[PDB]
């Protein structure tokens, strides 16, 4: 009926990690190759590269992420990166105009903006549709942050060695998550499941991204516009 | 005493290739990651990547460059790229303020600008000193363009297979070069040699760039700021 000291240390830790790695001002966005509205590919690529960087920083600060092997950190990051990015982008997503809005109109990404980076306007449907549902759940910062750490710490990913110690870390986080809602979120008797459903939503979005990403990554005139980080994270090289 | 029709076709061809690949307005420079005055590394990296692209385009248009094997094209481009880039940058170099000036002050590269991309202010001396000498020679567009094609077509590079057919192409170009000066450049009885000396100057600058480039390319936090093209051209992978 009340969260325990350690469940609270965990929440505190994650919240800060996210403040420390999610720039509310989006001030770094002027250092990206500018948007031109595959004319958006250089900018989005930089946005995604940058975002991978934040995600990595966030992860390092998840309780017991660092005690994992380098190999598992990499395995978890590579497979979960795009999902974390999709999740975190929800903070900039806006229901009023169905667009991610990043502190200025040079940094407003609408659905046409995005077709201009090589994706089909209709394999983007699920992503928008997902941001809108996620948004509707009016997550607490605590829960948003918790969902991301739970995502990252999915042991059901290609390449993970210790899917027993990662299961442990995840379970602990779902424990925190589930209590938090119960104890601290009026009207959320049904939320945990809605969120968990979002984790499965993500898997599919992940799948879809990989298919399009494979398409671009195979045409050198496109791959050349990515960054070394993107190429490495989204690449199929194997530890 | 007068250049032959074919020597003139060659000159015409090179001049155009250079117009077709050297944007006098430098209008593409707004698509680079902006300069911040290793804070200049993202911008210069984009400048260099872009420049490699032009150089490649130029090369393709050199008489008989395309009839070479893919392998030799690559071998010639990889080893000569930085030299061509250094040469071509002379068009934007200014004696009045010892700086490359690219159509706007966001695009004025002075020597401090450059230390901020990871190089020593004193392994840059030779490069500035070289631009200044090159500038002093007040090359005709014809000769500037000819020197670049002669550079590219140096057969004394690592990896070149047919250093007999490339020697042929180069010789032919030096023939054109040498006649052009004789027939069309008053006061240039000594120039060809001064230029040829510049080709050897370049080799050393090349050497020096490789040493610094190796330094940056080995620290992932730096290599990550380069582009796929830069990494590939300047990389040591072997055909």
């Amino acid at each position: 009926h009340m969260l325990s000291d350690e469940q609270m240390q965990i929440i505190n830790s994650l919240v800060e990690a996210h403040h420390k790695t999610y720039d509310d001002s989006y001030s770094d966005f002027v250092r990206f190759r500018p948007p031109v509205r595959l004319s958006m590919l250089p900018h989005l690529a930089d946005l995604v590269s940058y975002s991978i960087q934040k995600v990595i920083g966030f992860a390092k600060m998840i309780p017991g992420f660092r005690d994992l092997t380098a190999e598992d950190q990499i395995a978890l990051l590579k497979s979960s990166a795009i999902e974390i990015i999709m999740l975190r982008s929800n903070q900039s997503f806006s229901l009023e105009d169905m667009s991610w809005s990043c502190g200025g109109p040079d940094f407003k990404y609408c659905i046409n903006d995005v077709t201009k980076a090589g994706h089909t306007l209709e394999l983007l449907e699920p992503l928008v549709k997902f941001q809108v549902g996620l948004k509707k759940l009016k997550l607490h910062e605590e829960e948003h942050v918790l969902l991301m750490a739970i995502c990252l710490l999915s042991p059901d990913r290609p390449g993970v060695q210790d899917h027993v110690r990662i299961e442990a870390l995840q379970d602990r986080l779902c424990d925190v998550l589930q209590a938090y809602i119960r104890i601290q979120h009026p009207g959320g008797r049904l939320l945990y499941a809605k969120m968990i459903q979002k984790l499965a939503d993500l898997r599919s979005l992940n799948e879809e991204h990989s298919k399009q990403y494979r398409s671009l990554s195979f045409q050198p005139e496109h791959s050349m516009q990515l960054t070394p980080l993107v190429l490495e994270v989204f690449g199929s090289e194997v530890s | 005493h007068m250049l032959s029709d074919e020597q003139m076709q060659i000159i015409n061809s090179l001049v155009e290739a250079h117009h077709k690949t050297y944007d006098d307005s430098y209008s593409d420079f707004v698509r680079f990651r902006p300069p911040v005055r290793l804070s200049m590394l993202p911008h210069l990296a984009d400048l260099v990547s872009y420049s490699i692209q032009k150089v490649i385009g130029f090369a393709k248009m050199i008489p008989g460059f395309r009839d070479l094997t893919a392998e030799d094209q690559i071998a010639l481009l990889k080893s000569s790229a930085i030299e061509i880039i250094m040469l071509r940058s002379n068009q934007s170099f200014s004696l009045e303020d010892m700086s490359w000036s690219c159509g706007g002050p966001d695009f004025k590269y002075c020597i401090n600008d450059v230390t901020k991309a990871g190089h020593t202010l004193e392994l840059l001396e030779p490069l500035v000193k070289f631009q200044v000498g090159l500038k002093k020679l007040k090359l005709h567009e014809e000769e500037h363009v000819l020197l670049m094609a002669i550079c590219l077509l140096s057969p004394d590079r690592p990896g070149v297979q047919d250093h007999v057919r490339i020697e042929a192409l180069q010789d032919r170009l030096c023939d054109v070069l040498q006649a052009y000066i004789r027939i069309q450049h008053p006061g240039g009885r000594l120039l060809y040699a001064k230029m040829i000396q510049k080709l050897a100057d370049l080799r050393s600058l090349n050497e020096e760039h490789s040493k610094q480039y190796r330094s940056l390319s080995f620290q992932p936090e730096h290599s990550m700021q380069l582009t796929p093209l830069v990494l590939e051209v300047f990389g040591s992978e072997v055909s």
Partner: peptide
């Protein structure tokens, strides 16, 4: 393999 991820994980 994974030059940069490794570096950013130290």
């Amino acid at each position: 393999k994974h030059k940069i991820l490794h570096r950013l994980l130290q």
